[PDB]
Amino acid sequence: MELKHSISDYTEAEFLQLVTTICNADTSSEEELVKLVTHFEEMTEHPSGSDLIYYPKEGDDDSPSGIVNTVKQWRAANGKSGFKQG
């Protein structure tokens, strides 16, 4: 349980930090980078899930801020919850 429950436990920055440790790959192993992305999936339940990082539009950017900026708008379309408090 070292993690949290959903995106509500991660603010728009604490969560944007997660997608960074994944895309940027700041972990100490590629396996932890996957468990990092799959986790992203269980957070915003995004449909692409790990695609938001492994699915950069042909002409856009795969950076972490553009992917967390992507969910930020997703949660609105999906009318999901949102990050913690900022």
Side-chain angles (χ1 to χ4, degrees):
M1 53 189 156
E2 66 187 358
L3 251 178
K4 298 221 159 242
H5 183 90
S6 261
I7 223 145
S8 159
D9 357 305
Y10 291 88
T11 44
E12 44 122 69
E14 250 237 284
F15 189 64
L16 197 175
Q17 172 232 72
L18 174 107
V19 162
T20 305
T21 304
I22 323 205
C23 229
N24 278 257
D26 220 303
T27 70
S28 305
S29 309
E30 267 123 342
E31 180 105 40
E32 280 176 2
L33 237 121
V34 108
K35 235 282 232 216
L36 248 307
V37 101
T38 250
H39 192 229
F40 167 103
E41 245 238 64
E42 226 66 57
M43 252 48 197
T44 161
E45 305 159 39
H46 201 263
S48 244
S50 348
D51 236 355
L52 236 35
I53 312 128
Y54 303 136
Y55 227 45
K57 253 270 115 195
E58 206 212 22
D60 208 57
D61 40 282
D62 16 290
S63 130
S65 196
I67 299 170
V68 202
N69 180 48
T70 250
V71 77
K72 208 135 93 145
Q73 280 225 126
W74 185 83
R75 223 86 130 132
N78 282 255
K80 284 333 180 159
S81 154
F83 307 103
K84 210 227 261 131
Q85 192 130 305

